[PDB]
Amino acid sequence: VEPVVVIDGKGHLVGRLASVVAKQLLNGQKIVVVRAEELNISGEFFRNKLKYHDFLRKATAFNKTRGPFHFRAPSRIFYKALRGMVSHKTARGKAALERLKVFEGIPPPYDKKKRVVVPQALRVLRLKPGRKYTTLGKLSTSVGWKYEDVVAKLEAKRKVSSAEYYAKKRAFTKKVASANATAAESDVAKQLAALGY
């Protein structure tokens, strides 16, 4: 449908977002995911902290380097959920994984690009209300991710700019609306109306 699809991860459930990203890649669709720190996991914060520490004790006994790597960042916690859904040791898998980018925050050019959502991974649509869940940023920070403040800062700044942008556009669509309605009731208008437009 589009050469590139930018997903705003905020309010999405990790495994369900991962599951749909993986498939799109293997079908040849490029994906970049933004705001990974705003991602969600079901279960209360403590369960998922505990689950991370579970993952944290696994290491190669003779050399901790060869052993499993533990990435603390939100985008990387995500990439793990995703990479496990791809057969990543095959040329085909490595090919699909190169179609992917994950980001905490919304860095340049993507900030001025439109982003979309995935209704089948959306927490508020998916989780039954009252169930407890977890924000990826807080989880990561508890396991050693260093950058939560820097990201939140830059975002608050980015969010101010985007607000002006929006305001100017909402104003412009107010003129366009007024003009469109002054053309209403003319011939060409009523004719389009007949044809469903």
Partner 1 sequence: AESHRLYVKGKHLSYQRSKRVNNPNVSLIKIEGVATPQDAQFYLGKRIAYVYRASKEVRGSKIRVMWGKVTRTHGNSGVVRATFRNNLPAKTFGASVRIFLYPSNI
Partner 2 sequence: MAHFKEYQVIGRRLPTESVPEPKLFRMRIFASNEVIAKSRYWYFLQKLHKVKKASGEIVSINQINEAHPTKVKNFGVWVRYDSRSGTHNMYKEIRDVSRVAAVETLYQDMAARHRARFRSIHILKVAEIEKTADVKRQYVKQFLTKDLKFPLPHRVQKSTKTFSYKRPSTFY
Partner 3 sequence: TDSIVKASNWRLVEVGRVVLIKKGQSAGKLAAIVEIIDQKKVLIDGPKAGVPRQAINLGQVVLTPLTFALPRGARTATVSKKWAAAAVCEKWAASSWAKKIAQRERRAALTDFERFQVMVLRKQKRYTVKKALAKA
Return d(Cα 118, Cα 47) in angstroms, integer.
25
Residues forming a β-bridge with 33: 7, 102
What character string, x for contact with RNA (CB under 7 A) and - otherwise, covers 131-160?
--------------------x--xx-xxx-
Distances (CA, A) of 4 to 24, 89, 95, 123, 188: 11, 24, 16, 23, 37
**Binding at 190: pick from RNA, partner 1, partner 3, none (beta carbon under 5-8 Å per type):** none
Footprint of partner 2 (CB under 8 A): 1, 5, 20, 24, 114, 116-120, 122, 124-125, 129
173 interacts with partner 3 by CB under 8 A: no
Coil, helix or strand at residue 112: helix
Least gap, CB of 171 to partner 3 (angstroms): 13
The residue among 3 and 109 lying less far from partner 1, judged by its C-beta, is 3
Return d(Cα 134, Cα 126) in angstroms, integer.
14
**Binding at 108: pick from partner 3, partner 2, RNA, none (beta carbon under 5-8 Å per type):** RNA
Return d(Cα 155, Cα 150) in angstroms, integer.
9
189 interacts with partner 3 by CB under 8 A: yes
Return d(Cα 25, Cα 183) in angstroms, integer.
45
Distances (CA, A) of 139 to 41, 73, 84, 99, 173: 10, 9, 20, 27, 41
Q: Select the span of 20-28, 66-74, 138-146, 187-195 touching partner 3 (CB under 8 A).
A: 187-195
List interacting residues with RNA (CB under 7 A).
Answer: 1-4, 6, 8, 10-11, 28, 30, 32, 91-92, 95, 98-99, 103-115, 119, 124, 129, 151, 154-155, 157-159, 161-163, 165-166, 169-171, 174, 197
